[PDB]
Design a protein around this ligand. Sequence first.
Ligand SMILES: OC[C@H]1O[C@H](OC[C@H]2O[C@@H](O)[C@@H](O)[C@@H](O[C@H]3O[C@H](CO)[C@@H](O)[C@H](O)[C@@H]3O)[C@@H]2O)[C@@H](O)[C@@H](O)[C@@H]1O
Ligand SMILES: OC[C@H]1O[C@H](OC[C@H]2O[C@@H](O)[C@@H](O)[C@@H](O[C@H]3O[C@H](CO)[C@@H](O)[C@H](O)[C@@H]3O)[C@@H]2O)[C@@H](O)[C@@H](O)[C@@H]1O
Ligand SMILES: OC[C@H]1O[C@H](OC[C@H]2O[C@@H](O)[C@@H](O)[C@@H](O[C@H]3O[C@H](CO)[C@@H](O)[C@H](O)[C@@H]3O)[C@@H]2O)[C@@H](O)[C@@H](O)[C@@H]1O
Ligand code: MAN
Lengths: 149, 149, 149, 149
Amino acid sequence: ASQTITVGPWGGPGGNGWDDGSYTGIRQIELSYKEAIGSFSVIYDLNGDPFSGPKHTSKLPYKNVKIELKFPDEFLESVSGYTGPFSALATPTPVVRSLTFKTNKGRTFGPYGDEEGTYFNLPIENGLIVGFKGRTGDLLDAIGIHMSL
Amino acid sequence: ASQTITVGPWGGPGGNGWDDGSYTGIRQIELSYKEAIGSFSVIYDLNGDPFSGPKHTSKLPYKNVKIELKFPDEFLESVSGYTGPFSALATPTPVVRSLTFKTNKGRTFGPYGDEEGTYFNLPIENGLIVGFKGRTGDLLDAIGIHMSL
Amino acid sequence: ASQTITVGPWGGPGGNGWDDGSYTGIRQIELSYKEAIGSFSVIYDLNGDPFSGPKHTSKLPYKNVKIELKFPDEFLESVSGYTGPFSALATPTPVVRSLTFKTNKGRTFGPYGDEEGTYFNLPIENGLIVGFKGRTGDLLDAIGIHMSL
Amino acid sequence: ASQTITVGPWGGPGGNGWDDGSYTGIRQIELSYKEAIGSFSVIYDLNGDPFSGPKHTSKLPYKNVKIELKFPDEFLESVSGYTGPFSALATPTPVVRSLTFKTNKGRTFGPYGDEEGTYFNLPIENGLIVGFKGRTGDLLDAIGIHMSL
Ligand SMILES: OC[C@H]1O[C@H](OC[C@H]2O[C@@H](O)[C@@H](O)[C@@H](O[C@H]3O[C@H](CO)[C@@H](O)[C@H](O)[C@@H]3O)[C@@H]2O)[C@@H](O)[C@@H](O)[C@@H]1O
Ligand SMILES: OC[C@H]1O[C@H](OC[C@H]2O[C@@H](O)[C@@H](O)[C@@H](O[C@H]3O[C@H](CO)[C@@H](O)[C@H](O)[C@@H]3O)[C@@H]2O)[C@@H](O)[C@@H](O)[C@@H]1O
Ligand SMILES: OC[C@H]1O[C@H](OC[C@H]2O[C@@H](O)[C@@H](O)[C@@H](O[C@H]3O[C@H](CO)[C@@H](O)[C@H](O)[C@@H]3O)[C@@H]2O)[C@@H](O)[C@@H](O)[C@@H]1O
Ligand SMILES: OC[C@H]1O[C@H](O)[C@@H](O)[C@@H](O)[C@@H]1O
């Protein structure tokens, strides 16, 4: 097995751990949100063809959003968000409350969720996010990234 | 796009170029041979699951072989073979006449084909072959490799 | 030119930009601090031999510290700190107020400086910090990292 | 420790092993030759500045050559040569008899030495030679390469 620089998890130890692994790039990101981030799944690029990563779906009735990147001219240049406990859960471990994505083309996708708690910011000067890692219970407990050149 | 160190092609400019891309590792290699190498296709590992790469099948009635590696404890440590023209074709053009694979566990698979022509040898001290690239017409004209850590 | 995954800068646009480049690893880190981080320089490993990176020295009369890692068994597992403006300066741009280093061996070096402002945290699950990048004026305005496998 | 894809050695087990390690690129290559390759040393690029690698000098009275690449627009695209025993020596083990270097700019540097024995060829489609490894006794017994993106 090859390996990739893996950075992060930002968030808490709750939920179940998952790792989608590494691919060639990112085409589309799908997440649900309200006061925190619920569902999270992505459509990766695998050597030129779209490839659906495993779904990390949340049952909560949250609003869905689809982030379509203009692969391969456009790619994530930074990932940022907020982690903190959430009040509505039984629950006391930190969870990803908010997520914000910035592109090399200057596009910004939201702040989805409540911008409340402790802040995390991953600005990328050189390199590509090539896969996601994280934890999901009823919501998105933690998020992590795999990177390559 | 991520990229990988791509080394080679060994062989001639004949046939049609193909690139299977990059993956997480190699599970199984299938090739056909007689006096030269005909068919070539591989089952890669993609983040823990087997993944069938495109088939680069030859129509010649050659003998088929299946090389099953004990992924992930066992992996290719070296690739070697012979390149040279092949009388039976009218072509020219050099083609892969022979292939030999050595494993980190000490297993050697063949010499498949005629050990005739100009020799090529890729001994790997550190790193993993993570995908194949090459050219196929009626037979395997050339072969190349993608590598990662 | 080879390149490395370069992540961040955390901090402000003040001072002058510098990039020490990439090496084989990190042996020793030298910084000065008080209410903010002043000086910053490192002794890298270059293929087995110690190598002094350029000095990014601050003139402020701050307390000096030397962080000696037990290379190569011990290496940085995470970098974290605080960024915010600093009253005592004439310029209003954010500066690195605090820095904290955690090792794979479980050693934690400080919080050096004032743990005041906006927090940044870089937990590393796989990979190695292999060089630093940043900005220095009278103090350490920003800090960034180069990474490899 | 960071690591690099290391491919090779081509040649025999004679002499003493050496590894110059990894750098940012290659600026200049110095070798001596006659019927085989004698001396071998290189001036690497280390983050923009020239850096002399260890000398692997041969005492034989061979002809010296200096290969100056136009770093960083020009870089090695392939390394090839011949390995075989050499009568003039007392020891019977294979040695590097010949070396040939090709540039991305289309320049070819020699065939230095006797093009006699078993051939080796490393064509690079993507990636950079970033360091050399090998064995030296009275002559160059073996040669290997470190690669990066
Ligand atoms: O046996 C469990 C637990 O059940 C009760 O809690 C139920 C659920 O309440 C929800 O609010 C939420 O807290 C759930 O927790 C999951 O999801 C979160 C967020 O993804 C994650 O942090 C957790 O680890 C869980 O995977 C709960 O399951 C109560 O009866 C309680 O006392 C009891 O321990
Ligand atoms: O010399 C012109 C400069 O004079 C005044 O600044 C003097 C210095 O005041 C210190 O407090 C500090 O602000 C210095 O600034 C540098 O260092 C900080 C921190 O590293 C950095 O953010 C800045 O970009 C500077 O490199 C000042 O030099 C002011 O009147 C100022 O406006 C004037 O330019
Ligand atoms: O000193 C002892 C040595 O004597 C005879 O060898 C002397 C040398 O003869 C040379 O011509 C050559 O074979 C040397 O070998 C070195 O260099 C080669 C080429 O780089 C390398 O392959 C070898 O490993 C050596 O480093 C000899 O040193 C023989 O009787 C010999 O067996 C004895 O050791
Ligand atoms: O593959 C061997 C040979 O097969 C056919 O003759 C053609 O496709 C050639 O271009 C190719 O070189």
